[PDB]
Design a protein around this motif. Sequence first.
Motif: not given
Lengths: 426, 68, 23, 427, 436, 48
Positions: E264-279
Amino acid sequence: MREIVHIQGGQCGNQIGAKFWEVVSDEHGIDPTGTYHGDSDLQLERINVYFNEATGGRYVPRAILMDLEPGTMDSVRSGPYGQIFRPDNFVFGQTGAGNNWAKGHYTEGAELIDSVLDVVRKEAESCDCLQGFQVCHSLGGGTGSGMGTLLISKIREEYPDRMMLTFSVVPSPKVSDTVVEPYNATLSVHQLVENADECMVLDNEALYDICFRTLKLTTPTFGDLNHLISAVMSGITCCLRFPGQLNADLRKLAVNLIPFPRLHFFMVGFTPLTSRGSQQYRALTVPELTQQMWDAKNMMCAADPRHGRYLTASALFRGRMSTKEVDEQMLNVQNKNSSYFVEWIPNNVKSSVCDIPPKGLKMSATFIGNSTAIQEMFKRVSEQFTAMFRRKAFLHWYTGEGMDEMEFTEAESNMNDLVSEYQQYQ
Amino acid sequence: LWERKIQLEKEMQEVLDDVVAEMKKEIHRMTLRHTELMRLQEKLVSDMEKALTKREIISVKGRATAAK
Amino acid sequence: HPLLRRAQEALKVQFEANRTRLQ
Amino acid sequence: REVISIHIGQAGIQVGNACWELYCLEHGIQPDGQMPDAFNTFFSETGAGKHVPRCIFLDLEPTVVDEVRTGTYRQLFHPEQLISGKEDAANNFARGHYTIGKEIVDLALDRIRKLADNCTGLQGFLVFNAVGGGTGSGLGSLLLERLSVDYGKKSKLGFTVYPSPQVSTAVVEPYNSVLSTHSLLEHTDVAVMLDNEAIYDICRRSLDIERPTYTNLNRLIAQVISSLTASLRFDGALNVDITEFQTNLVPYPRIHFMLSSYAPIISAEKAYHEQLSVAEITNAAFEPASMMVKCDPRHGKYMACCLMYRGDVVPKDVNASVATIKTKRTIQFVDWCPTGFKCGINYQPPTVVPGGDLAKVQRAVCMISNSTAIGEIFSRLDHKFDLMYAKRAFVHWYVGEGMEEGEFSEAREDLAALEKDFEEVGA
Amino acid sequence: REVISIHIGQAGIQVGNACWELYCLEHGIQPDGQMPSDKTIGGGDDAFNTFFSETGAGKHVPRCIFLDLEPTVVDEVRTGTYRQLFHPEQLISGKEDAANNFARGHYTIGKEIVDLALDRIRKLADNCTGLQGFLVFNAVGGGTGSGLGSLLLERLSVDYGKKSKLGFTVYPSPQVSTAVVEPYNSVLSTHSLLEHTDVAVMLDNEAIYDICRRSLDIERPTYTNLNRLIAQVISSLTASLRFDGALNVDITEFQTNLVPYPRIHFMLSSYAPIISAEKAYHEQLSVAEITNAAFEPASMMVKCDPRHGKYMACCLMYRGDVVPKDVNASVATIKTKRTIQFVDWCPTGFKCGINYQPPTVVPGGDLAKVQRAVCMISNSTAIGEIFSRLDHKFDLMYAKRAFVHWYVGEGMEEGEFSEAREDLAALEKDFEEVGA
Amino acid sequence: REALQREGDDLDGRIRVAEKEVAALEATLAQLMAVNTNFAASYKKVGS
Ligand SMILES: Nc1nc2c(ncn2[C@@H]2O[C@H](COP(=O)(O)OP(=O)(O)OP(=O)(O)O)[C@@H](O)[C@H]2O)c(=O)[nH]1
Ligand SMILES: Nc1nc2c(ncn2[C@@H]2O[C@H](COP(=O)(O)OP(=O)(O)OP(=O)(O)O)[C@@H](O)[C@H]2O)c(=O)[nH]1
Ligand SMILES: Nc1nc2c(ncn2[C@@H]2O[C@H](COP(=O)(O)OP(=O)(O)O)[C@@H](O)[C@H]2O)c(=O)[nH]1
Ligand SMILES: [Mg+2]
Ligand SMILES: [Mg+2]
């Protein structure tokens, strides 16, 4: 040696207590920072009744502020003399009862009251010989009525032989601030009748009448009312602190006034009260003090004593006097008004003297009467409570929070069978 | 089919929702009765202190009678 | 019950003091 | 201590457009969100030196919100809090409620959730809409149910622009209003009605305006809301909060419809001359000519009133004025309310809003009452609904959208039961 | 503690071109292999040890092997804006294309270039002093990434073996796709990747498109947009070695606390915060909501709902000034959160790495300068669904022997087709047996 | 709806133990007054 802890319940109670502390601090000679800056040593001889010593001479007050909104705490801190207070005891919630006896006796006090009892226990066993407790509150509100009465019940159940002095601003319906004042007031008196041991009744109608007539004030603010109430608040407990030619402990007053267990609501007064333009044109003698003290338009209650009978009266003088003169004046009064005073209690008046006056006045006096007129003041609230109760108005806001109608009916029955004894002994 | 689904939902949500009110009334009234239980306990406390005082007074009375 | 015992113990103490004085 | 503002439909969005430009200058915050803690109830500090309002503007037609996006407060709001649908509800309750509402109400809820998460000590919600149209009626009656079933325990102050009898722009208002007032009776907690004709008359008389547009009206309601929330934003000698107000006023669970009034609603030329004080400002608020709903307070007994005094007012003249108004026999209180006043005071004067004719005054009174006088309002709107519904007119649009013919009858009977309740409690 | 990088295929080399720019910007290296003369340094003379190496006079060269067969993107890099930075010899370009053919990528053309890249790998490793591990970046849906990548993985496992490997590989999306014959390459490369790469990190083209559509507010994104946040994710992963971390995790913490079983070596990835300049300046970035958005299913680089499975374990790398109290409270909130459910046999399953370096910003980019960021790598069990769906796609193609002649014209038989099939089946069985 | 009934049953049991407490308090108090009055009468009688 003798001891009194102070507890300030609700917004009105907090404000009154804050002014009371700013008054006692002056009478004892301390600056708002906390240190001692006075003239005599008789100031600090016996400040252990209300004060505690910190490392550095910083004297702090044996007080516990309490409310459910942080706004009143912030206002008290902002005001002068807000530093002397110990930051630990500022217990408060966040929701606020919102003039909801349910939300002050069943919901917010469900959790904050364990903390307030923890603080009061800390303060009580901080001292050696407790004499009594002190509470400042108003039965017409929602967070000073349910919260205050449940606090009184907790303290009564905990300490059985340490009596309480509660200063209750009874809602007189000539001043209107909220609509459910008679729901709150009767339901608070329901427990105040049986749990507490003395209750000084105060009211804004009589306070306003005083500030209009006697003080010759044009625009008085709540500060003047609180400064007036502080007079009795700090005069009831002056025999504890300063030496007297005839002492009067709090239990001395309790025994001398309270004839029967169920009758411990007293009407208070302060003397001399004078305007800035007539203080120069009047003198100050003991007969003048007595005649201004007994004048019915001076009592800080909505109960004219001519409508009632003085079961037991008490006088607390401060300053160098003559005890023969004092007793002669009291017996003169009891012989002149020989119809109001009850017949089966000879010499209904108890006098006492103290050797230190309030700061500035050469002589002063405080009056405490257990008149039976207050049955009118309590019927005036009971009939309004019944007026709303008949058509079931504003009641679901309590019923939906666990409180049945049995509680309201029992509260009305107790309010009825209190004025029953008032009339029976009138 | 959509009509039958809507009928099923409205019936199943009309049956979704007062005897619990009276039962909780009983619960709170019995909570009052157990506040009365605490009252009984404090009455016991009062009788206990009265017993202590009576014993002290009677013992001192017996001492006084022996003295006389 | 135990609460009765606290009163009974005080009674025992007072009687014991009386008896010791008499001794 | 927080309340979040949700505006639905053009009327609500524009009322909030005036309301937020009022708050920004009252707190000192520039349009693009920066100072040169009282704002915490409305503005939340984000990043450094930037403040964002706790509001969401929502509508189906996009151009009304594009007005806000392209105005002068474009930097102010969160660029997503300005929701936009794709096709207008077309003043059709069924279309706004069922057909279009589903795609966007879930987004509205998922944004309200994160607003509440950003908040900590929430008092509750304040919503803006009008029950005359279709958007603010259907979307309102759906969103209010969603919030009452999700949060449930919160208080939702609904400031609804109720439609006036004579002046009425739309034509399906007798249907839309009853369809809204089915839900508005039993999902919100306090519903402050406002009437365009009444506020027109107020503008005509007090402000001598003979061409009163929507902007002046909107400024007026903005001032009312500011006076309502000043007790929480600031401090006063005698204050009031949401629970205070909402458990003091509402007598029974199904009687909550405020009548709003304001004073001194006076222009500069008369405000510089005519003197002002509590003992005559209170009577001025009670006068029918200055009540914001086209109703007759004389016909109905008063049940419970609430007064709020911005500006320097000592707590004694309010007592004197309460006495001197309760002593007048023209206005009758309800028999079972021996005391029927709740007074609150503040320490801040109303802030003059540049761009308007409203005066800069030392003190002001906002009055919110609860009285049985509003029975004729419901009775007359139901009468004209009966007029339209006698021949089944306009029912075909709603039927094609999906609404049957029987829910109209059930809602009409609900309104009739409401009127019966008002009559019974008047007795 | 240097880490070497291998980029195989056009996708891999493009990701490297868009990622080494991030590294050279983070370490203040000018885009020609030098530092600016003036002191414009964030701090330290060895924050760039893991990726570069000074040679006599401030001439740093990346530890990268850009291996590809068809030379159209390799020489695009060679003539791009990075010429005096890259090593002229590391950039290995073959002769002809692999053409979506695992056969041509792994047997015909691969055999004459693996032994040419291997010597450069050996020279880089011998130059390195404290080598940490390999980071592979490739595409299974093509020829060079799948074929040559698998061959290089096998021939590095046979040699070095003990060292860790982190394989960032892209897969085809369930619906969005470009190559027609991608299932064959995907399964063939998956069989090789199973038992050789130590830790497999998964990426998906549509799973990044939809994030760039819902968060970065771009309705027409592209590869040059996906690769930037892929570089961001790998930088968040590698920042612990680089910068001073109060609670930092070296490369072996991933394998030590996130691989309960070697299969078992299979992994989801996530990254926060995905934000731009406007917000960005309108929202408030706090460790509660950034973590909550990390664990929401709408911000994962792998198109898969974690609801269908149970999070076996997780790692959270925090950048920027973050105080550990808030992250501890946040993981407590996650443990109290209802929707995501854990296998009951793991009571502690949150590794919380923290560093003291804020996320970087590249000029002309989309993401703005922010205080703190979080990268969430989760070993879940929803990835069996991904493998099963890919397999169900593969079955229809293999039933009719379609495209098979192109494969079998080279050394590839059908035996390895069948064995890759049964290997994926065994993986399915393992994941499902993990189950409750 | 039935868990509140379970709490009701628990309070039923607590009411029963409250009844037993009532009985015990009554017994203790009655014995107290009887013994006390007899003992006080004895010590007011003997020394005369
Ligand atoms: N105070 C105020 N009321 C308004 C304004 N615009 C419309 N109204 C009122 O809104 C009532 C009917 O609602 P609509 O005009 O249809 O607005 P809506 O309900 O949002 O309908 P949509 O056009 O679908 O958005 C009218 O009777 C007006 O009295 C405004 O700008 N200010
Ligand atoms: N996200 C992303 N994916 C890419 C990029 N370039 C290629 N891909 C993916 O790569 C997959 C196909 O593999 P190829 O790009 O042809 O890579 P390869 O293995 O070298 O194949 P050949 O060039 O024929 O040798 C496509 O399905 C794309 O999803 C890129 O720049 N960004
Ligand atoms: N002396 C004094 N009385 C006050 C003050 N503020 C309010 N009151 C009185 O308190 C009464 C109501 O108590 P309230 O504050 O509503 O109680 P609460 O809501 O439970 O805190 C009113 O009749 C006021 O006259 C004050 O500052 N000083
Ligand atoms: Mg509209
Ligand atoms: Mg290629």
